[PDB]
Amino acid sequence: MTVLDREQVLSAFKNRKSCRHYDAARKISAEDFQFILELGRLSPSSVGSEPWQFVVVQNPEIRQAIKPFSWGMADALDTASHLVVFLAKKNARFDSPFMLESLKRRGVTEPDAMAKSLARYQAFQADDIKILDDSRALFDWCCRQTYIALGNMMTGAAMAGIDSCPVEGFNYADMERVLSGQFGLFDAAEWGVSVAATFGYRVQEIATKARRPLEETVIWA
């Protein structure tokens, strides 16, 4: 365990501010950006599902195709170093091939053990969080996991001096149609767009943004 002082941790964490305007001349190096991708890869996920894909949109033709409906990051599409569109797994039922592969990656591979795990996953999805019925709720469950990877990538990037902005401000149906249909980047039957993020170096200073006081957020029980 490599342990940092919590004051140093908090200080670096406060580096992260949503950046809408990047220096178009400055690119994140390939090695620096793989480190950001690694924070996403290593993030936790319910049952180790890792129900995400990271679409790195560096092709300016694709950035221009999505600009008309991406008002939340319109300027950044011309100036950001990197763009990631997060995909979340569709129909991640306990009995799906995708979930089976995630179960073996947890180290559960003997057939009787696998059956017992799947039975618990079925009860969780059907009885506890109640998502097995509804395909949109099942998709939203996986989307939730991708916001963990999103948060970790942005935080880690900022601690290392690289700016970012989380992004929901786009038409989700158009984004899926362009990325999956026009450019054929993923099978939209298996994956759906969750959220996006830009990364780069800020063009100017960014003011720290307000938060509600802790006493209006924490409930002590």
Next chain:
Amino acid sequence: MTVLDREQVLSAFKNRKSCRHYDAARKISAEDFQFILELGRLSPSSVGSEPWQFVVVQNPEIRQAIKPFSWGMADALDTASHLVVFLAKKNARFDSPFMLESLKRRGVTEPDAMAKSLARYQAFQADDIKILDDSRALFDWCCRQTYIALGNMMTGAAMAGIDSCPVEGFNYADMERVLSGQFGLFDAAEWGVSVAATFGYRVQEIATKARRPLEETVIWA
């Protein structure tokens, strides 16, 4: 900006492993836990909504009350230093008083300016992410934001040497009934249970868990 080297960031990030069994005698100090809550407070959220409450469940009467349906953390309820149950805002429509407050906290308070922002929020919610036809989709939108705070609190804790585990393994309807109905901790019309996390100091070594290779997660475009 106080900047850390990315190899130092990655090394400290790798401290985080899901911990199911804590040292029951080891308590996180008040100051250290305030630091953890602060990581969640400062987390970003869509339109700065901050649609979360953090219920800190330190009362062992409450912990024992939720244990029978909390199989995902049954042993940790006896041994964890701290437990946080994350609530997400219900019915966070563009025209709700809660969203009005978050908009003023962004520094938009002139009535014509506020009116124009709320018009954009309405279009975002109705047309882009499409969450205004279903109260569950609206609630799930807020739940996604809470997983950012979850990710940041666990990573930051781990970087400072404090173990954690994210938790979905409980009956969600029972959790709301006990926390809101039996113990009156929140108004269930206004807030719903999103996810939980335990925090403490691990009782034994934890093996690093596998992840899919980056080449099966990253789509270069």
